[PDB]
Design a protein around this ligand. Structure first.
Ligand code: RCG
Ligand code: ANP
Ligand code: MG
Length: 378
RNA sequence: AGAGAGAGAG
């Protein structure tokens, strides 16, 4: 079961070289548990707390299985958003730096002609993509399922949700029967675990009790606002705390992201906005500026709730409380990456603290009123 | 279911 060193995982020498060149020294808890079953070829359901290294868990496993002399697509990774798929593609490339493995990002919003040209020239070893564009390229037969032996759903419970399950099933239908299936997520509700019985062969389940999901290093607070109409002034009062670090402010609708961004611009606050109705070129610019520290404060929808890794984020503001319990863990998990200290602030009206209490009891976690000392916890 | 949030091309 447990293996506490990358040197003890029978990895290729050049793969191990890429891990160490990337900055990793010891495998995290989930890497100690899940990499070997995945490399062995078992179907695996791998759950672990936010920010504990689930990407490299499947990235290392995929890279170790690739036949580099076989110029065909051998592994397919799906993610719910374009920004996450792009982030994963970069991690795979960095860990495979000394291997000569090809990994291509297959996502909506990018130039179709250029991608078709590339795919027809050479079949990448690894595809990381979003379901729409991947299915499109399968349908056009510019991607071939012929040699795909590994199929990974990151954020798997979102990939099996109401809007994604049919998309995943249409892709799975084009895959060979013997394809290995690996699922990863911070959250794995029992209804999701049930449906995995339809397409996974007695998988290895590496699970986490929901009452043990919250990270000790992320202090959760609430701010009484009483009325929705005072949230704007409360956020502006927090601004100089938001900019100590980098902060993400979560909003439940695209429309309100635009509303809040303009209100804060009108008061001369420097903030960036992010949601799915922006052009992909706009989305890429905003994400790049945030990753580089050029912009410190991001107002966004749940587009960025899952998987996005920006080490410098240590503050998450739930301006709107999430209507999905599982989504709460993902949102606050944008801070406190890989053991770092983080803070989550929930802005709660009267009608809201009913929801906050349900969150508290779901995760067996206590969310106290925000202290005046909070700028020092950043 | 739907809404919300995402998720091909044109
Ligand atoms: C012929 O090749 C196709 C390729 C993709 C699609 C789609 O991909 C997207 C992606 C989207 O990002 C904005 C929007 C969208 O529609 C608004 C679509 C779709 O057209 C539509 O929603 C499809 C869907 O889920 N249906 C029918 C219940 C979806 C889909 C994705 C993956 C696998 C199957 C289907 C449709 C056809
Ligand atoms: N073994 C490791 N040693 C050091 N840093 C690591 C290691 N594994 C992962 N990390 C870093 O930890 C951060 C979080 O990794 P990531 O793969 O995004 O976690 P995650 O479990 O997928 N988070 P999430 O999807 O939001 O639940 C990244 O900055 C990684 O580079
Ligand atoms: Mg992740």
């Amino acid at each position: 079961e447990i293996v506490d060193s990358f040197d003890d995982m029978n990895l290729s020498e050049s793969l191990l070289r890429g891990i160490y060149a990337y900055g990793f020294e010891k495998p995290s808890a989930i890497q100690q548990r899940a990499i070997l079953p995945c490399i062995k070829g078992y179907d695996v359901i791998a759950q672990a707390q936010s920010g504990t290294g689930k990407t490299a868990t499947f990235a290392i496993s995929i890279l170790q299985q690739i036949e580099l002399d076989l110029k065909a697509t051998q592994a397919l990774v799906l993610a719910p958003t374009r920004e996450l798929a792009q982030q994963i593609q970069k991690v795979v490339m960095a860990l495979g730096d000394y291997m000569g493995a090809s990994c291509h990002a297959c996502i909506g919003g990018t130039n179709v002609r250029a991608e078709v040209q590339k795919l027809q020239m050479e079949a990448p070893h690894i595809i990381v993509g979003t379901p729409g564009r991947v299915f499109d390229m399968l349908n056009r037969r510019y991607l071939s399922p012929k040699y795909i032996k590994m199929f990974v759903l990151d954020e798997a419970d979102e990939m099996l949700s109401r809007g994604f399950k049919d998309q995943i099933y249409d892709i799975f239908q084009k895959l060979n029967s013997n394809t290995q299936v690996v699922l990863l997520s911070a959250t794995m509700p029992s209804d999701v675990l049930e449906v995995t019985k339809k397409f996974m062969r007695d998988p290895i389940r590496i699970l986490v009790k929901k009452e043990e999901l919250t990270l000790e290093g992320i202090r959760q607070f609430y701010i009484n606002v009483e009325r929705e109409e005072w949230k704007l002034d409360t956020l502006c009062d927090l601004y100089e705390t938001l900019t100590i670090t980098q902060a993400v402010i979560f909003i439940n609708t695209r429309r309100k992201v635009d509303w809040l961004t303009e209100k804060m611009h009108a008061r001369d606050f420097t903030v960036s906005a992010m949601h799915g109705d922006m052009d992909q070129k706009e989305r890429d610019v905003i994400m790049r500026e945030f990753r580089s520290g050029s912009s410190r404060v991001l107002i966004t929808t749940d587009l960025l709730a899952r998987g996005i890794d920006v080490q410098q984020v240590s503050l998450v503001i739930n301006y709107d409380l999430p209507t999905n319990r599982e989504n709460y863990i993902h949102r606050i998990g944008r801070g406190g990456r890989f053991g770092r200290k983080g803070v989550a602030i929930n802005m709660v009206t009267e009608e809201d603290k009913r929801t906050l209490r349900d969150i508290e009891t779901f995760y067996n976690t206590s969310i106290e009123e925000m202290p005046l000392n909070v700028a020092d916890l950043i």
